[PDB]
Amino acid sequence: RPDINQGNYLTANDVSKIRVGMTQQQVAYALGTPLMSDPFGTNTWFYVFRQQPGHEGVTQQTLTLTFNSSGVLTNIDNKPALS
Amino acid sequence: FVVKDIHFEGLQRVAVGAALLSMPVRTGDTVNDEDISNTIRALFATGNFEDVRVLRDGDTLLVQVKERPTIASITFSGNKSVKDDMLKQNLEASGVRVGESLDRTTIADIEKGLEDFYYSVGKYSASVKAVVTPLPRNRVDLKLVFQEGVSAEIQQINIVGNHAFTTDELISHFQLRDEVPWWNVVGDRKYQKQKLAGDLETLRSYYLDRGYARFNIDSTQVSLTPDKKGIYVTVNITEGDQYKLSGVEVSGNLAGHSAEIEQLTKIEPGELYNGTKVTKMEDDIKKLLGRYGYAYPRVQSMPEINDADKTVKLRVNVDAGNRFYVRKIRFEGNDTSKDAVLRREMRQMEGAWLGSDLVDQGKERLNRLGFFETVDTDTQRVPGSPDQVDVVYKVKERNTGSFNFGIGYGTESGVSFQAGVQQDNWLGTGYAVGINGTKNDYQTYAELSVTNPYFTVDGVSLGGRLFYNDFQADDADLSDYTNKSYGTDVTLGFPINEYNSLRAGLGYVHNSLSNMQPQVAMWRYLYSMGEHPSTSDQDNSFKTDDFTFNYGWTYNKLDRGYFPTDGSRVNLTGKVTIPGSDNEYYKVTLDTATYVPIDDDHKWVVLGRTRWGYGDGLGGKEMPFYENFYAGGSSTVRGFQSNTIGPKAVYFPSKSDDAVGGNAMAVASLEFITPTPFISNSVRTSFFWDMGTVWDTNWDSSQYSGYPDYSDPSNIRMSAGIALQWMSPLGPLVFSYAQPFKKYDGDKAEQFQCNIGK
Amino acid sequence: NGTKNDYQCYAELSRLFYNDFQADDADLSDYTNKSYGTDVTLGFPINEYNSLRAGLGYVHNSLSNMQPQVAMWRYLYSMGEHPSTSDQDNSFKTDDFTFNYGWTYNKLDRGYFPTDGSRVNLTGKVTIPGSDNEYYKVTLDTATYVPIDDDHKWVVLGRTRWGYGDGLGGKEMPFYENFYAGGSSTVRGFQSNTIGPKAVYFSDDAVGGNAMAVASLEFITPTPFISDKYANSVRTSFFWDMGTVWDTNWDSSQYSGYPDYSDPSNIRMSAGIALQWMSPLGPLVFSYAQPFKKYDGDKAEQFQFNIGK
Amino acid sequence: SRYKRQVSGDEAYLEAAPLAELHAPAGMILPVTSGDYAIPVTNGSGAVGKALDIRPPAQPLALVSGARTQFTGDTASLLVENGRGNTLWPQVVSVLQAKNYTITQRDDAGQTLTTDWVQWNRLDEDEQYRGRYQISVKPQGYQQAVTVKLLNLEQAGKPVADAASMQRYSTEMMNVISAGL
Amino acid sequence: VKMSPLPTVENQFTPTTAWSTSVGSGIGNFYSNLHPALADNVVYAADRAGLVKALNADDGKEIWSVSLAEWFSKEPALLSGGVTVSGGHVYIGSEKAQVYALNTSDGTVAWQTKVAGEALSRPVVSDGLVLIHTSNGQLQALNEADGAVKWTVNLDMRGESAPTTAFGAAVVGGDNGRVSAVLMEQGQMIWQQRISQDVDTTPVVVNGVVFALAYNGNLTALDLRSGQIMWKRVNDFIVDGNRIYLVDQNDRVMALTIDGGVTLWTQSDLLHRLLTSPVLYNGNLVVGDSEGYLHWINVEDGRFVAQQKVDSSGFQTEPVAADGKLLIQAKDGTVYSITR
Amino acid sequence: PPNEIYATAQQKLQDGNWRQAITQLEALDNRYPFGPYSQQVQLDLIYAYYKNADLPLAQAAIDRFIRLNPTHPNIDYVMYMRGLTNMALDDSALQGFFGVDRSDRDPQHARAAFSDFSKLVRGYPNSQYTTDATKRLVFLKDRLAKYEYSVAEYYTERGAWVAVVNRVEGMLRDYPDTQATRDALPLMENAYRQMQMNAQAEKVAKIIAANSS
């Protein structure tokens, strides 16, 4: 089973350097564009970091960022490691 | 002058309206000579007319005119070195083309123009003469006579300033010539434009890689002896000193990939400046930064020259932009093969970080299949995002699949039918189905094979085949018997690595033999297991039920599936008979194909082919003869008949010359592949040298003395000759001329072969 | 440029032709013929419907699997090489330098399923003194199509074919490169090569003969019950065939009690239907046949169905 | 016959399922559309599938050098730069008199005439057309206009009012005279 | 467009004098200015390989045989300068950017000075300086004695051009259709006239006028200081009074007047035979051709022609006439004296 | 003599075969490029190419005619003929006999066909060819949708869940009202459920339950 890679690459330091009150352009600049967004009603940037090497199971960090109406006040919801 | 009417004379193609539109003066206008002159030179400025006269009739203003002659033909005569159509292409662009007209003042300019072209390509004696033939209805045919000028030799190339490297070595490493050898008539003493720049570039590179830091070509001169019979190319160069190398520096944003960079950028103190090494280290650091997502970096390498120590240090300024994520992987070209198989062979997924070698492994895997002619990966970026990239693939199909099917039924004769069909993409689904069918009147051969290379998505492949064949012997009474064999096989194969495959399966084989005249080999097999048949009497029978199990290991690593130019292939298959059968044996056979190129074009390739295989029974049982190994014929070892190498049977009353094959076979071929500079591919011509050997490991020599003892394989056969291979829409075909220089008494030789091969 | 069949390896070059012939599997009596030669041939159009060609050729032929049977040893026998009796594997080989000439005529309206126009080729071959067996053959084939309806969908067509060989100078014709008849484009009722003199060992199997005549007549009808799209890929015709082949060397009755094959009076006539359909995987040929007058020791193919070739 | 006028291929595309658009769930937006590929319906109605004739629209033909063909409505118009009109009108008359069409009415003064039915002989079509035409000569740009107007058009008894034919057979008449001149 | 046949031999004076010794291995298919020179009863001559044979004026005696070719020791020096002798030195130029100055007696003294490029020009001696016009648009000046003072004038940028001297000035052609005059101390006073719209555009100064040809074939005369009084019509012309005798690039032999270019006449019976320079010899014009014939031409109107085959290769170098002898060098690489 | 060659070519186009008519028209166009009837000759040549089914030259003639004639009353014909040529090149294959579904194969011809037909229906609403164009467009969109669904299904069987949700989002943005998107929607639902994002799954479930099937 070949190596399955999914999502955008994340690191401790790059995931730490986003805080409430940032505009959409800086977070995009510091982490790249989101590979998946929410096309239903709201707008929330989903940063999933899923990788699954063969016969080892998954490691996945999910970075879900929910905006205000105007692309400020980034609530930061972090679910570090799945269960 | 009051103009109450405008009247025309001489108009033919140009209608009244165009002329009338063109004129400043109009009906009802009051006109002076000025307004008439303007009108005249207005009419002249439309490109439609040759001579014009605007005169005053009693009340009317009369415009007289003669239109330009309409080109009906453009013919070319004497133009050895220029295509008529291309020459036409330039001409339609410049202005002259059929349907339009001829300015009789420009023929000179046409001539001078083409002549100018010819001057600007070397032939200063070139003369282009335009003959203009009139036809009725103001028509014209213009024939251009082209006369190539006397060839002007490129007499010499001179390099002034050099002190360490001789001139004739630089001309031996140029492309332009001054003295072509009389024994090498492949090149001429020619002169072009881009070849001069190429020579300057190769001289600069040959001086920059030897270790010279400061070096600059000053100017180039192109002289001409004053009859257009010779050209002199003179370069004036200078060279400072031979320099050394001190140390490399690294600076920029590179995201922690520093250890491997420091490891690969090492240089020996005491080594000197190099020209191709700096660009090699730059292309290596670029390929390495591309192997993690940073696909479009910015790396510039300029050194700071220190002249006091005759040694220079250089820095590289890496600038890696942010990662690139694949967004869509679309395939263009696949017209009969479905989209699923190309995605299964793809190893680079979608929505992940771009691994520029993970995208190349998929290209190599698509190339090694053999369904496709050519595969190329092109990286395209969508402009609607800073960092998001698309990977596309262009494929061109290759059809190798052939229906030959025929059924013929009779009242007074048995039904006859011929059927040959094999396919490695049934409907592009991915299967391989194959059926062969022959029944003339006595033989009957039928087999059906279907296999699936992806029964899961990981690569676990299963397939099976079914076969039945039997024939009556009474067509040629030479060591032939009544053979009846029906059998079904079910094979399952899975990969354990990204290269290596394994496969297991069960098989039922039923063999029925009858009407075999006595020779001692088959009886040596009968005497061990079976009965005691009557020594000089025919019409004996023997049936066998077999439950075979087979294992196989494969190493496939090539570039193309049919004409491989790199890598090697290993194949090992072997079957063993399980307890609960009639005979009990094991067979082991091993294929090996090795390809090595010598150049960087991958045109001249060495080809080594190796085949080994071994058979033995279990517990006194003696390895049924009908399953034995035959060598000989094309594609096993060339320059012999089919199935002629090995031992030769010993008939009971006591000697004849029919070959029956043996237990143990060793074959190795060495082939050198050479190109063919005539074909625009599908052809491949090679020279081949190859050795074949088959023997039998149970031939007692205590009985027989004059009968040839086979068990000591020093009787190695050999062959040589030329082989040309070519693929057809019928299928892959091969025919080879072979002359066996070492042969043995009994080898039924032949010197021309043609079969499927591959 | 090269075609592997059950019959031949024919490599053609652009003329270097190597031809392999193996009738051990095939319908002719068992012999092997492997041959290499090169010819060059200048064609000359005259009126953009007719042309000629002069050609000089060299041909080698070798034969190594001669099943012993008389009326083939006679070709050897006049040649001087004494025949071996009742031996399995003999061998002889000769070279022929050969001049060939021909004329062809075409006026065909289209490329598949003609409805109007003509076709003829007329071709012949004479060796040069300098070869070791001189012989004469000349042959013509001719097809022509004439509609009877104004829509060109009811069209009668006929074809006849004529072949003759001879040996001058006192030497006789090689038994190979002889004419055959009976296949599915000469008489669709019989097996591939079944009309001919029989093999006679030292049996019913057709060795062939030096002279051949053939003629077909066929009535193309429109196909009544075809689908909407398929109009012109589906031909359906009805036909009666006849043909004859006979020999010239063995017409003496020195081997009495045999039909002696110099009497073409037995005409071998056979009428049946044909259906000829271009499908997206290949062409298909289909004949229901009746040997309306047949001759002794001959083979029948009432239902013939081929896909390809 | 009948084949030359229809599109190649099956009509299966016609059968295609109706584009039903899915209704939005409660409290959830669907990106209704962003890109192109949106489809506007006009209900036609024009011919569909084989019924539709795809024959190349006849174009009015101007054999004379510097002659303008324009077509509008049921009228083919050929403009030719000549001196006088009253002499060309009877040249036209000589052409049509050579073709022998039936003249219900005529008028040399108005330089116009009305014909009886005209029967065409085209191979591309199965049911032949009848044309009633008025043909007239009117100078408009000091050069005259030969004008053909297809008053009544009939396809095997039934009077037709489809567009293409009106052109194709107005133009037939036009190309007849043009050729004749 | 091709070679024209040979005029008729109405010979009134026959040339039957020759004494020949070969030198070197010829010039081959290159175009160069290798032409021998005579002064003081010794003729000096060279070839591309580097051989330099000195011969007595009468018979070819008094020989010494040097080698000037120099990863090979004796690598071919590619002499293409042509030879000059004055005051006791021999000057020769190379396509390896060397000027050699050899002592007259034994050839032992060989002192050279690397110059800036191909020295394809005839070395010119004057005033204690030897002038060299270089192929890459430079004019370089070397000392007669040792070659120390090297001042340089650039020219823009096919024909090398000899310099000449008159009352202390240098007059020099050029490779850009331009004639320039440079003062041969450092080029202080410099003017430049465009006189054009390969060819040795070597000027000679009579009555303070510079005459120079052009590669497109208009002859111009300029005043020596300013160059305003001008009429406009391989080339090599001569002056012997009030007449000019010229050979054009259209190969027709034609004599012109000194004032304005009236009195043209054509003698084109030698057309496109690729003539060399002409010379004045013994009151007659002599001209060579490429196909290996000599031609003698009378002076009154240019009618009579005395043609003989003398040497099998051909002529492509300038003949020289002084001290009663006419010496010529063939492509084969021999020498010939003529008298009549 | 162009009038007679034209009369011959028009009597053989109306009555006779195609190969002869194409040959005659091409000859006439080569001999008289700027003829009086230089438009109708190219038109008939295009028609003959389309009916004889040598497609590359048909496309090249269409493009030539468009480049040279951007304004003409009967441009609807050449536009619908380019659309026909593209769709014939797309669905001209032998799989129709076997009947294996042909939505997976390369869709590039369908894209161009759709483009041309859309352009036609936008520019010229009251022409003769509108109804067939609309039907062709609907069928082509349904095709392209099924192709997208196929790729989604493959990536579901493979497993790479971001790519799945991305392709289904692209399909829902592009082809909102078609049968393939409805079917696909459970694939998107599954993909959301497989990763641990339990907010989008409930919205997808609600949308599915809204449109029963």
Side-chain angles (χ1 to χ4, degrees), chain D residues 6-60 62 66-67 73 76 83 85 90 98 109-110 131 139 141 145 156-157 159 161 163-164:
Chain D
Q6 327 158 24
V7 304
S8 308
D10 59 54
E11 290 183 324
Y13 74 89
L14 291 166
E15 325 301 329
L19 309 177
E21 49 192 355
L22 27 74
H23 295 283
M28 293 183 284
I29 201 43
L30 295 53
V32 169
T33 301
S34 302
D36 342 345
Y37 300 92
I39 292 190
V41 54
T42 186
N43 264 359
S45 288
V48 294
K50 300 310 197 60
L52 178 57
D53 184 8
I54 64 174
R55 283 194 292 173
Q59 242 281 122

Side-chain angles (χ1 to χ4, degrees), chain B residues 150 155-156 158-161 163 166-167 179 189 219 221-227 229 232 234-236, chain E residues 2 29-31 48 78 95-97 114-118 135-136 138 157-158 198-199 234 274 316:
Chain B
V150 55
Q155 325 274 157
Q156 81 149 336
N158 180 351
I159 289 75
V160 167
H163 278 292
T166 183
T167 73
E179 276 75 34
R189 320 163 77 171
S219 84
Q221 318 306 317
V222 283
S223 173
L224 286 178
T225 175
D227 55 350
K229 192 175 65 63
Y232 293 163
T234 295
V235 289
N236 184 16
Chain E
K2 292 309 164 189
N29 314 331
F30 307 142
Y31 183 66
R48 302 202 78 258
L78 297 182
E95 295 179 12
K96 268 164 160 181
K114 182 170 210 304
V115 286
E118 271 93 346
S135 159
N136 60 349
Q138 319 199 19
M157 73 290 100
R158 299 208 172 134
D198 278 326
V199 192
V234 53
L274 302 176
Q316 258 178 336

Side-chain angles (χ1 to χ4, degrees), chain B residues 506-697:
Chain B
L506 293 175
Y508 180 88
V509 170
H510 179 285
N511 275 298
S512 158
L513 307 175
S514 314
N515 272 124
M516 42 189 186
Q517 80 266 53
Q519 78 260 22
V520 76
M522 297 153 55
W523 283 58
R524 199 180 63 195
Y525 155 69
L526 264 295
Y527 266 102
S528 87
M529 177 59 173
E531 311 95 307
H532 280 273
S534 159
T535 77
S536 289
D537 178 282
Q538 271 72 14
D539 302 334
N540 50 4
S541 84
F542 195 55
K543 71 172 185 62
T544 42
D545 283 338
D546 275 348
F547 282 74
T548 63
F549 159 72
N550 49 2
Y551 60 78
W553 158 57
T554 295
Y555 180 103
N556 201 337
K557 179 187 179 307
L558 305 174
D559 264 20
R560 217 168 303 112
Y562 45 89
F563 280 158
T565 50
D566 208 335
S568 88
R569 185 189 198 272
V570 172
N571 191 311
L572 189 148
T573 171
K575 52 186 174 185
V576 166
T577 42
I578 74 176
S581 195
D582 206 358
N583 47 39
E584 279 160 299
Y585 73 108
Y586 67 95
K587 148 191 168 176
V588 171
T589 177
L590 191 145
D591 202 335
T592 301
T594 300
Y595 289 66
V596 293
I598 50 182
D599 61 330
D600 273 323
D601 176 283
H602 300 93
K603 190 73 72 64
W604 313 73
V605 194
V606 172
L607 194 164
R609 275 183 182 179
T610 309
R611 178 166 167 89
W612 289 67
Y614 199 82
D616 182 18
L618 275 299
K621 281 86 173 176
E622 206 48 51
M623 179 51 176
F625 55 96
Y626 51 82
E627 200 265 331
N628 266 324
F629 285 155
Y630 308 111
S634 160
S635 87
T636 306
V637 52
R638 301 176 175 83
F640 293 105
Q641 267 203 3
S642 295
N643 310 65
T644 180
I645 320 292
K648 287 155 179 57
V650 181
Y651 293 158
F652 265 80
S654 85
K655 165 63 69 61
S656 180
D657 203 77
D658 262 347
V660 307
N663 287 1
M665 155 182 172
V667 163
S669 159
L670 268 299
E671 295 198 2
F672 193 95
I673 286 177
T674 58
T676 312
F678 312 101
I679 307 312
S680 174
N681 305 124
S682 316
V683 309
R684 184 169 299 261
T685 76
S686 196
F687 299 146
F688 57 94
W689 167 67
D690 51 356
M691 309 169 292
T693 305
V694 171
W695 70 85
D696 195 303
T697 174

Side-chain angles (χ1 to χ4, degrees), chain B residues 257 260 287-295 323 353-356:
Chain B
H257 296 250
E260 48 270 6
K287 180 181 181 179
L288 188 60
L289 280 189
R291 215 177 63 188
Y292 290 90
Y294 312 90
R323 296 180 177 270
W353 42 86
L354 171 61
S356 46

Side-chain angles (χ1 to χ4, degrees), chain D residues 4 7-8 13 19-23 25-26 28 30 32-34 37 46 48 54 56 62 164, chain F residues 14 37 44 47 50-51 77 80 111 114 128-129 131-132 135 138 141 173 176-177 182 203 206-207 211:
Chain D
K4 304 159 260 190
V7 304
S8 308
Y13 74 89
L19 309 177
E21 49 192 355
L22 27 74
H23 295 283
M28 293 183 284
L30 295 53
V32 169
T33 301
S34 302
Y37 300 92
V48 294
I54 64 174
Chain F
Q14 289 168 323
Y37 296 138
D44 297 310
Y47 171 62
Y50 172 66
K51 296 269 301 292
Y77 186 84
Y80 178 74
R111 204 158 303 260
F114 203 93
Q128 296 166 335
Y129 312 87
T131 306
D132 184 1
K135 299 296 183 181
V138 150
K141 184 171 76 169
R173 304 171 65 99
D177 61 356
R182 311 170 72 80
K203 324 191 188 289
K206 290 162 61 180
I207 186 167
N211 304 133

Side-chain angles (χ1 to χ4, degrees), chain B residues 403-411 413 418 440 442 475 478 726 728 730 733 735 752 754-756, chain C residues 1-4 6 9 11 18 24-25 30 88 191 281 300-309:
Chain B
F403 286 99
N404 300 344
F405 193 97
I407 284 186
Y409 179 86
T411 69
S413 279
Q418 165 46 259
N440 48 7
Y442 59 97
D475 197 71
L478 311 94
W726 154 70
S728 159
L730 163 56
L733 258 54
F735 36 88
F752 280 91
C754 164
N755 49 358
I756 302 298
Chain C
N1 65 330
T3 74
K4 177 51 178 180
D6 210 298
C9 278
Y18 177 87
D24 168 48
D25 64 28
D30 290 345
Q88 298 304 318
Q191 301 199 0
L281 75 169
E301 293 294 342
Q302 271 63 239
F303 297 69
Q304 194 166 6
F305 171 76
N306 182 335
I307 282 178
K309 291 306 178 184

